Design a protein around this ligand. Structure first.
Ligand SMILES: CO[C@H]1O[C@H](COS(=O)(=O)O)[C@@H](O[C@@H]2O[C@@H](C(=O)O)[C@@H](O[C@H]3O[C@H](COS(=O)(=O)O)[C@@H](O[C@@H]4O[C@H](C(=O)O)[C@@H](O[C@H]5O[C@H](COS(=O)(=O)O)[C@@H](OC)[C@H](OC)[C@H]5OS(=O)(=O)O)[C@H](OC)[C@H]4OC)[C@H](OS(=O)(=O)O)[C@H]3OS(=O)(=O)O)[C@H](OC)[C@H]2OS(=O)(=O)O)[C@H](OS(=O)(=O)O)[C@H]1OS(=O)(=O)O
Ligand SMILES: *[C@@H]1O[C@H](CO)[C@@H](O[C@@H]2O[C@H](CO)[C@@H](O[C@H]3O[C@H](CO)[C@@H](O)[C@H](O)[C@@H]3O)[C@H](O)[C@H]2NC(C)=O)[C@H](O)[C@H]1NC(C)=O
Ligand SMILES: *[C@@H]1O[C@H](CO[C@@H]2O[C@@H](C)[C@@H](O)[C@@H](O)[C@@H]2O)[C@@H](O)[C@H](O)[C@H]1NC(C)=O
Ligand SMILES: *[C@@H]1O[C@H](CO[C@@H]2O[C@@H](C)[C@@H](O)[C@@H](O)[C@@H]2O)[C@@H](O)[C@H](O)[C@H]1NC(C)=O
Ligand SMILES: [Ca+2]
Lengths: 235, 54, 419
């Protein structure tokens, strides 16, 4: 996250970090004790991933961390990198041992498709992650968060020569300076409703980061809520 | 009008659904229970989704 | 006349030596004098052998930095006045014995030509200052023809000093001359007691280098990170960071080779980082000019993340013992030394008491701003767990060369960049 601020411990208890051959290469959100939702381009079936919930500073021990191994990787069935590495950019990860919910490890709420979209249209969401704090710069040590405004589709389509599908939305500032960045993908875009946060998007892509006239592109979660509920049901 | 999900979300803290004859049915997401006021949502579990408790 | 050595021809200023040497028995770079090229190649052959001997005389936990070229040039100035066995040994040790007859007879001139070329290029890609000179005892009468040639091709005549009656003052004078000429960057090149009343002739060659990156590191990305030294300990170093396209290659046994160019692209820094567990000491002994060149030929440009510490290395040392072990004997022997070209053969012995080198390397973020990429491309926001990473948080070797010629201007070892 570029131009964001330090989160406080427990401020985004649903946020998790994904570690692989490189640490903090992507983020994710807790759906429930056994499942994480992230971006499909962050994962590959057969490639190991470690999830750390209750994380704050990725280079220090806070005694709130819960580390889990991923035992199942489920990219959305329509995801196909060969016909675009970012459309339907969403995936689910099943954890080996369930997380123990507490103040630092709590799921993000997920409403039905109708309300997820209503919440997205409130026009203001929070993005968070341990991604780069400067384009092509260092990854964050302490979890960063940033409030981003929704950008109308017309304006976004005109800001890029690339395709913005109906499964994506745009958010960020016209003037530049604040945006999600590399390392943040898979992390959540959430909308706080009367003190309760709901998942409204998945950090996905963009053209560089925090550049004037460019916006962050996110996976529109409302379109995938039914699939998420179906795949992650513990019931 | 008078009472529809279209005005202030039927006063529902979270979810609203139009019943018949000027009435609405509020509801909450998993981990929550409709409060006494039939409009608000309150924790039904130790750590309900989407809330900071530190 | 006001002859400019850098644009002169050997015939412009006749400067033949008193004695000449005659041995018993890739493609040429663009726009390059073949004689300068063969001299550069000889320096590299000398460099690899000398470094091994130098490393052996030092502790593996200490940093190393030197300019083998500076050393080769300095001894070519004694070659100019040497004869017989003293001359032969000089030719064999510095690997000059394989070059052509004209380059050999005018070797001091071609070293000037080589240094002229490299300085011109380096002066636009870094801050580089040097101070080189020979100092001899006042009691001796030096060949004035040698003095004129030296002033032209080496920048200064041999300086007479009263070692016999004013050793300490002489020492101070030498250190002052070097400091003053290097703008205070190189001090105390000759340590206390390093010279005395029996000192006859000493060679002093010093150099400071601070390069300007073609693609600079942004200071906002520099932060404290642990550096794991070979002594098993770790220390806090200022670690620079940047992501960009650089010539790179992971060679046998996992060793990483990275080339970081300075402004102008002609001069570059090559870093050799062994995998964890493979001592740098092993890579030093286990590496011949052939191998290194092979790696440089396999380098391919590619996007990667580079972690490199910012540091400074100050390395000063005597060359006498190491060169003697390499075969340079007569030159340091009062009775055996034959340097008639500097001081006519006579009752007084003229030999090299010692040679002192002192090199200073400074590495930081400064340089040209990274060039803006104008390629319209989508960038996923994953960090890319499959990316190539060059993290120099452990001992590594450094080389500073001129690409076309492949000249090894500087070489060294960063064993501890901490303060
Ligand atoms: C017995 O045989 C041995 O000894 C004899 C006699 O030697 S003695 O006089 O010392 O007693 C040698 O014969 C003598 O030496 C000849 C020789 O070629 O060395 C010849 O030298 C003179 O003329 C040449 C050619 O001049 S030119 O105008 O025709 O080009 C000259 O060499 C040229 O120097 C150029 C230069 O500017 O440095 C080079 O330019 C290229 O490189 C520069 C960059 O250089 S850098 O890398 O240092 O930075 C570049 O400019 C940036 C140019 O860009 C255009 C490059 O040109 S390019 O085409 O590559 O792009 C030339 O490169 C080709 C180079 O060509 C040879 C020489 O200058 S010198 O090298 O500095 O010495 C010049 O010396 S001289 O002016 O003082 O004389 C002599 O001609 C008189 C010749 O004397 S003789 O005729 O009486 O015999 C034998 O050499 S050889 O067999 O003739 O080749 C020698 O054999 S051996 O080598 O011992 O085996
Ligand atoms: C002071 O140093 C001078 C520089 O070397 C030196 O002059 C050079 O001397 C050599 C021989 O002493 C000359 O070469 C002549 O001799 C060779 C071999 O003896 C002959 O084969 C050659 O044909 C040639 O005639 C150099 O040409 C000459 N170079 C010059 C002009 O400096 C002085 O001799 C030294 N002073 C003394 C005498 O101590
Ligand atoms: C030193 O050399 C003197 C001359 O030797 C001859 O000329 C030199 C340039 C070589 O070409 C060599 O092969 C020739 O023999 C000798 O007269 C003198 O004795 C030598 N002094 C010693 C033995 O150190
Ligand atoms: C000290 O140096 C003075 C000038 O030296 C030249 O300029 C400096 C900046 C360096 O680039 C150096 O390499 C140059 O030679 C001399 O004028 C002065 O005499 C020197 N000190 C004395 C009196 O020895
Ligand atoms: Ca931690």
């Amino acid at each position: 996250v570029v131009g964001g601020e330090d989160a406080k411990p427990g401020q985004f208890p649903w946020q998790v970090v994904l570690n692989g051959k490189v640490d903090a290469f992507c983020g994710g959100s807790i759906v429930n004790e056994k499942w994480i939702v992230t971006a499909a381009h962050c994962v590959e079936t057969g490639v190991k991933i470690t999830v750390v919930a209750g994380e704050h500073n990725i280079e220090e021990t806070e005694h709130t961390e819960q580390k889990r191994n991923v035992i199942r990787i489920i990219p959305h069935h329509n995801y196909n990198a060969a016909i675009n590495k970012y459309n339907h950019d969403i995936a689910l990860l099943e954890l080996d041992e369930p997380l123990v919910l507490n103040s630092y490890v709590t799921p993000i709420c997920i409403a039905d498709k109708e309300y997820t979209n209503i919440f997205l249209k409130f026009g203001s969401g929070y993005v968070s992650g341990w991604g780069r704090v400067f384009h092509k710069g260092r990854s964050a040590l302490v979890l960063q968060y940033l409030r981003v405004p929704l950008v109308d589709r017309a304006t976004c389509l005109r800001s890029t020569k690339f395709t913005i599908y109906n499964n994506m939305f745009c958010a960020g500032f016209h003037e530049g300076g604040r945006d999600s960045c590399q390392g943040d993908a898979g992390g959540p875009h959430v909308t706080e409703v009367e003190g309760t946060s709901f998942l409204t998007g998945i950090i996905s892509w963009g053209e560089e980061c925090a550049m004037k006239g460019k916006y962050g592109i996110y996976t529109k979660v409302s379109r995938y809520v039914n699939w998420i509920k179906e795949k992650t049901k513990l019931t | 009008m008078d009472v529809t999900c279209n005005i202030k979300n039927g006063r529902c803290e979270q979810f609203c659904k139009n019943s018949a004859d000027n009435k609405v049915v509020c509801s909450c997401t998993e981990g929550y229970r409709l409060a006494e006021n039939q409009k608000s949502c309150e924790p039904a579990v130790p750590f309900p989704c989407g809330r900071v408790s530190v | 006349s006001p002859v400019d050595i850098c644009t002169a021809k050997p015939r412009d200023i006749p400067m033949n030596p008193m004695c000449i040497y005659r041995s018993p028995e890739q493609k040429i770079p663009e726009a390059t004098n073949r004689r300068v090229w063969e001299l550069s190649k000889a320096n590299s052959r000398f460099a690899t052998t000398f470094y091994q001997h130098l490393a052996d005389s030092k502790n593996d936990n200490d940093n190393i930095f030197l300019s083998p070229l500076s050393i080769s040039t300095a001894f070519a100035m004694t070659k100019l006045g040497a004869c017989n066995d003293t001359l032969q040994q000089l030719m064999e040790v510095f690997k000059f014995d394989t070059i052509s007859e004209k380059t050999s007879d005018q070797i001091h001139f071609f070293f000037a030509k080589l240094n002229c070329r490299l300085y011109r290029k380096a002066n636009k890609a870094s801050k580089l200052v040097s101070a080189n000179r020979l100092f001899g005892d006042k009691s001796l009468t030096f060949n004035e023809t040698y003095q004129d040639i030296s002033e032209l091709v080496y920048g200064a005549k041999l300086q007479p000093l009263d070692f016999k009656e004013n050793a300490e003052q002489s020492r101070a004078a030498i250190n002052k001359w070097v400091s003053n000429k290097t703008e205070g960057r190189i001090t105390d090149v000759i340590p206390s007691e390093a010279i005395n009343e029996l000192t006859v002739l000493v060679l002093v060659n010093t150099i400071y280098f601070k390069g300007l990156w073609k693609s600079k590191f942004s200071p906002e990305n520099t932060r404290k990170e642990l550096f794991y030294k070979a002594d098993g300990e770790s220390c806090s170093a200022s670690m620079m960071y940047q992501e960009g396209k650089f010539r790179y290659r992971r060679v046998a046994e996992g060793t990483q080779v990275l080339e970081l160019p300075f402004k102008g692209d002609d001069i570059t820094m090559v870093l050799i980082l062994p995998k964890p567990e493979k001592s740098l000491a092993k890579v030093e002994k286990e590496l011949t000019p052939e191998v290194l060149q092979e790696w440089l030929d396999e380098l391919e440009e590619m996007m990667l993340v580079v972690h490199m510490p910012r540091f400074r290395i100050e390395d000063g040392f005597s060359l006498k013992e190491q060169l003697q072990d390499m075969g340079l004997v007569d030159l340091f022997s009062p009775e055996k030394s034959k340097l008639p070209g500097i001081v006519a053969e006579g009752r007084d012995d003229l030999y090299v008491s010692d040679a002192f080198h002192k090199a200073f390397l400074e590495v930081n973020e400064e340089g040209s701003e990274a060039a803006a990429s104008t390629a319209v491309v989508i960038a996923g926001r994953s960090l890319n767990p499959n990316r190539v990473t060059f993290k120099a948080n452990r001992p590594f070797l450094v080389f500073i060369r001129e690409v076309p010629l492949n000249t090894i201007i500087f070489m060294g070892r960063v064993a501890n960049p901490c303060v």
